[PDB]
Ligand binder design. Structure first.
Ligand SMILES: [Mg+2]
Length: 119
């Protein structure tokens, strides 16, 4: 997973910092987006290998962010979710995955590495 680049889309700075240092200490590179517009910009400009996408974004919603990215590229996604809209959550499998909030940060590492290996 070394050098793999993870786009972390999360508006809570502390939660995003926790995810970031857990991923970096495993040897991955991290790019932070604080909202959906930034996620779309950074996905376009950076060589992203996987997107970790919180459904709870300030203006747009995780699902329509994902739809906008999808019609462009098939980049793997792991959605961070509290579990309504459970239908398209289960649909993520799929080749994608999800992490339920609150999570143990080690689960994020494990699912990122697994999805990357799979894809
Ligand atoms: Mg968020």
């Amino acid at each position: 997973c070394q050098d793999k680049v993870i786009l972390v889309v999360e508006d809570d700075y502390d939660i995003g910092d926790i995810i970031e240092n857990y991923l970096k200490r495993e040897g991955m590179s991290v790019i932070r987006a604080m909202n959906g517009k930034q996620a779309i910009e950074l996905h376009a400009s950076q060589p992203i290998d996987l997107i970790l996408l919180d459904i709870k974004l300030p203006e747009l919603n995780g699902w329509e962010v994902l739809n906008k990215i999808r019609q462009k590229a098939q980049t793997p996604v792991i959605m961070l979710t509290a579990l309504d809209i459970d239908k398209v959550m289960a649909l993520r499998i799929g080749a994608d995955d999800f992490v339920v909030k609150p999570f143990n940060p080690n689960e994020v590492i494990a699912r990122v590495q697994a999805v990357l290996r799979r894809t």
